[PDB]
Amino acid sequence: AMGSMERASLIQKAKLAEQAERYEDMAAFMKGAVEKGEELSCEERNLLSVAYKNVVGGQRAAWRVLSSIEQKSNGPEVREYREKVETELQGVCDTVLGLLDSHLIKEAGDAESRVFYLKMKGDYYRYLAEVATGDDKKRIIDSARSAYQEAMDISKKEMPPTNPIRLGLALNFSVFHYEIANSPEEAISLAKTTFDEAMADLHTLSEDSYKDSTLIMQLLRDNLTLWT
Amino acid sequence: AMGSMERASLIQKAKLAEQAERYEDMAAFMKGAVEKGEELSCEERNLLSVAYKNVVGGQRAAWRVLSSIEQKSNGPEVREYREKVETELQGVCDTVLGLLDSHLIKEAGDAESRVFYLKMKGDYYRYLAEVATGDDKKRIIDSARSAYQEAMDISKKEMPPTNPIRLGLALNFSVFHYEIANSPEEAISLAKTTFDEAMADLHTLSEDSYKDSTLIMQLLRDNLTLWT
Ligand SMILES: O=C(COc1ccccc1P(=O)(O)O)Nc1cc(C(F)(F)F)ccc1Cl
Ligand SMILES: O=C(COc1ccccc1P(=O)(O)O)Nc1cc(C(F)(F)F)ccc1Cl
Ligand SMILES: [Cl-]
Ligand SMILES: [Cl-]
Ligand SMILES: [Cl-]
Ligand SMILES: [Cl-]
Ligand SMILES: [Mg+2]
Ligand SMILES: [Mg+2]
Ligand SMILES: [Mg+2]
Ligand SMILES: [Mg+2]
Ligand SMILES: [Mg+2]
Ligand SMILES: [Mg+2]
Ligand SMILES: [Mg+2]
Ligand SMILES: [Mg+2]
Ligand SMILES: [Mg+2]
Ligand SMILES: [Mg+2]
């Protein structure tokens, strides 16, 4: 549907939609931009991530409300409506995963792009895992793990320990361990090592970089406080 | 699209969607319920109102953000995107107005239903007026006025001055005077007379009715403080 709109116009409208808090529109504009086939800049990758994080975040919040009501109930209506929301959420995750697979990850050669997109791949498989059951659940969990692991391997080789993309990936992979993989020890170990290694590298940063890094370190700290 | 779902199931799902903050779904469920052709109870009228108030409220907020950006700008992109949001907002108002006209108002014989639906008709024409220009704007403004006026005439004859539906109608009609009709004196006069007449009738109310009435009186007071 965005085929006829200029790439630059799609990006401008994504930024307008963000200002207007119209995240579904923002996601559709950014999907349109990705579908132009050109690589995305740092700023554009962030718009893509913000758009979809907000759309799926609304769906996750609703799915949690409905799943809780359903669990307390256990007519077909609560299950039906939870399934409707679930299917829409799965559709959004599949769309994002589709964009990463066609062809963002394949064309991403710099560490900052490649780690960003692999982290996104991990996150959206993780959101699929949250609603999955049984064996289905196992292959989705391993897809999330695999994407996070490749992202981590590159991040550790190519980025300093205070790099915000590296920090956010480790944060999210630790949440995956705690919430999805039933590995709270791995979660705590990862968050603590990441935090400690970032602390030791802060002395190399400017005021503004220090601010960006320490903000994410505080999230690692918040989790560690929740988990210990 | 809701033709195949039971009326009772649509109402149950509207309530679930409200809990999940899924207002677009809530509105679609309630549109489905209205389209069953049966009158709506007090509780169901409130679900219909809440659903659409939230959907149009999001669109109004976005339209205001974009209109402000557009005014500061004065490429085609801001205007295009403001028009897109505007058209969607107009679509929602036209849908609500359509439900009231087919056939909620015509079948509504009790004061509490008839005033409720005429107030809604005033409100949705008012939202259309907010984005309208020129002469177009004049016929829409008079449609809002006419609906509010019929609602007021019934409310004054049939309801006590503390009735929350009567109070909310007067509040909204005063906002129409202030914001749409360029009649701030009429706005202030209406809010003040409504407030004073409700005050004098509070002595007749139970604790819970007193709470409901005084909450809306506080909104009239808030406006009077804003306007004077
Ligand atoms: O509240 C959270 C917290 O979850 C995290 C904490 C630390 C790292 C990663 C996550 P997330 O599970 O990727 O969102 N997530 C969340 C966010 C939204 C929002 F804000 F994007 F709309 C909505 C729903 C949820 Cl669960
Ligand atoms: O903030 C307001 C205040 O406007 C009023 C104040 C007193 C009476 C009636 C109105 P309204 O213009 O019918 O919403 N309206 C508004 C509400 C939403 C919400 F909360 F429904 F999402 C969104 C946008 C607006 Cl402008
Ligand atoms: Cl459903
Ligand atoms: Cl490459
Ligand atoms: Cl547009
Ligand atoms: Cl009648
Ligand atoms: Mg071009
Ligand atoms: Mg039931
Ligand atoms: Mg399912
Ligand atoms: Mg490097
Ligand atoms: Mg231990
Ligand atoms: Mg039936
Ligand atoms: Mg331009
Ligand atoms: Mg227009
Ligand atoms: Mg009466
Ligand atoms: Mg005067």
The residues spanned by each domain of chain A are 1-228
Task: Answer yes or no: do B65 and A9 touch at CB < 8 A.
Answer: no
Question: How far apart, in whole angstroms, are the C-alpha atoms of residue A45 and residue A47?
Answer: 5
End-to-end CA distance of chain B, in Å?
A: 48
Question: How far apart, in whole angstroms, are the C-alpha atoms of residue A166 and residue A155?
Answer: 6
Q: Evaluate whether B123 touches B151 at the Cβ level (below 8 Å).
A: no
B12, B61, B85 ranked by CB distance to A77: nearest: B12
- What the block records as the tokens of B70 is 């557009």
- DSSP 8-state assignment for residue A135: H
- What the block records as the tokens of B190 is 């209406």
Find all residues with CB under 8 Å of B119, minimum gap 6, and list them. Answer: B147, B148, B151, B165, B168, B169, B172
Q: Is B19 on the interface with A (CB under 8 A)?
A: yes
B102: phi > 0 → left, psi -120 to 50 → alpha, else beta; which?
beta
Question: How far apart, in whole angstroms, are the C-alpha atoms of residue B191 and residue B174?
Answer: 6
- DSSP 8-state assignment for residue A6: -
Question: How far apart, in whole angstroms, are the C-alpha atoms of residue B226 and residue B187?
Answer: 12
Closest CA to ligand 1's atom 10: A172
Question: How far apart, in whole angstroms, are the C-alpha atoms of residue B81 and residue B104?
Answer: 33
**Closest CA relative to residue B17, chosen from B33, B41, B3:** B33
Please report where in the chains the tokens 């505007």 appear, as a residue.
Answer: B86
Q: List the resolution, Å.
A: 1.8
Q: Evaluate whether A17 touches A25 at the Cβ level (below 8 Å).
A: yes
Q: Evaluate whether A144 touches A177 at the Cβ level (below 8 Å).
A: no
Question: How far apart, in whole angstroms, are the C-alpha atoms of residue A31 and residue A130?
Answer: 24
Question: How far apart, in whole angstroms, are the C-alpha atoms of residue A185 and residue B27?
Answer: 45
Task: Give Dmax over CA atoms of chain A in angstroms.
Answer: 61
Cα separation values, B15 from A21, A122, B9, B113, Å: 25, 34, 10, 20
CATH placement of domain A1-228 = 1.20.190.20
Give DSSP secondary structure letters for chain B: --TTS-HHHHHHHHHHHHHTT-HHHHHHHHHHHHTT-SPP-HHHHHHHHHHHHHHHHHHHHHHHHHHHHHHHH---HHHHHHHHHHHHHHHHHHHHHHHIIIIIHHH--SHHHHHHHHHHHHHHHHHHHHH--HHHHHHHHHHHHHHHHHHHHHHHHHS-TT-HHHHHHHHHHHHHHHHTSS-HHHHHHHHHHHHHHHHHHGGG--HHHHHHHHHHHHHHHHHHHHH-
The b-or-e profile of A128-156 (16+ CB within 10 A means b, else e) is bbbbbeeeeeeebbebbbebbebbbebbe
Question: How far apart, in whole angstroms, are the C-alpha atoms of residue B42 and residue B121?
Answer: 17
Residue A104's H or E segment, with its range, is: none
Question: From which experimental method does this structure derive?
Answer: X-ray
Q: Evaluate whether A145 touches A181 at the Cβ level (below 8 Å).
A: yes
Q: Evaluate whether A22 touches B62 at the Cβ level (below 8 Å).
A: yes
Find all residues with CB under 8 Å of A104, minimum gap 6, and list them. Answer: A34, A39, A40, A117
Q: Evaluate whether B97 touches B125 at the Cβ level (below 8 Å).
A: yes
Question: How far apart, in whole angstroms, are the C-alpha atoms of residue A144 and residue A150?
Answer: 10
Task: Answer yes or no: do A66 and B20 touch at CB < 8 A.
Answer: yes
Cα separation values, A184 from A80, A154, A173, B55, Å: 33, 24, 11, 40
Contacts of A21 in chain B (CB under 8 A): 58, 61-62, 65
* Residue of A15, A22, A24, A29 to mutate, testing the B interface (most B Cβ within 10 Å of its Cβ): A22
Atom of ligand 2 nearest to the CA of B171: 8
B210 CA distance to ligand 15 centroid (A)? 17
Question: How far apart, in whole angstroms, are the C-alpha atoms of residue A101 and residue A20?
Answer: 29
Q: Evaluate whether B174 touches B193 at the Cβ level (below 8 Å).
A: no
3-state secondary structure (DSSP) of residue A130:
helix
- What the block records as the tokens of A157 is 């080789």
**Closest CA relative to residue A57, chosen from A34, A98, A26:** A26
- DSSP 8-state assignment for residue A161: T
Q: Evaluate whether A100 touches A117 at the Cβ level (below 8 Å).
A: yes
Give DSSP secondary structure letters for A18-81: HHTT-HHHHHHHHHHHHTT-SPP-HHHHHHHHHHHHHHHHHHHHHHHHHHHHHHHH---HHHHH
